[PDB]
């Protein structure tokens, strides 16, 4: 979220943003409510994540 990054380097170095926010909870909340269908959606996040 935050980066100090003091002296030597003009490279952004903010790969932290790909560690939480962004398309994370922000693609999530962006649209169709869901409500019970995430249930189904996450039942593939495990019907897959078994192997």
């Amino acid at each position: 979220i935050k980066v100090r990054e003091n002296e030597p380097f003009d490279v952004a170095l903010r790969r932290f943003k790909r560690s939480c926010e962004k398309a994370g909870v922000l693609a999530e909340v962006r649209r169709r409510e869901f409500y019970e269908k995430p249930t189904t959606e996450r039942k593939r996040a495990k019907a897959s994540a078994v192997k």
């Binding site: 979220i1 935050k2 932290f16 560690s19 939480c20």
Partner: protein, 55 residues
């Protein structure tokens, strides 16, 4: 874990952001990941820990 007052042991179960850390990272047991959260929550309510890095 054993308590919310343990902001010490506690502070190594949350990200910079303040967000609780999944059990799949901590390798924490089950029973305890709950004891943990329920104490981090408590710590959050009692201004003993931020909900947010906004503060």
């Amino acid at each position: 874990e054993i308590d919310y007052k343990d902001i010490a042991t506690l502070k190594n179960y949350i990200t910079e952001s303040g967000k609780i850390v999944p059990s799949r990272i901590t390798g924490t047991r089950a029973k305890y990941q709950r004891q943990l959260a329920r104490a981090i929550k408590r710590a959050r309510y009692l201004s003993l820990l931020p909900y947010t890095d906004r503060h």
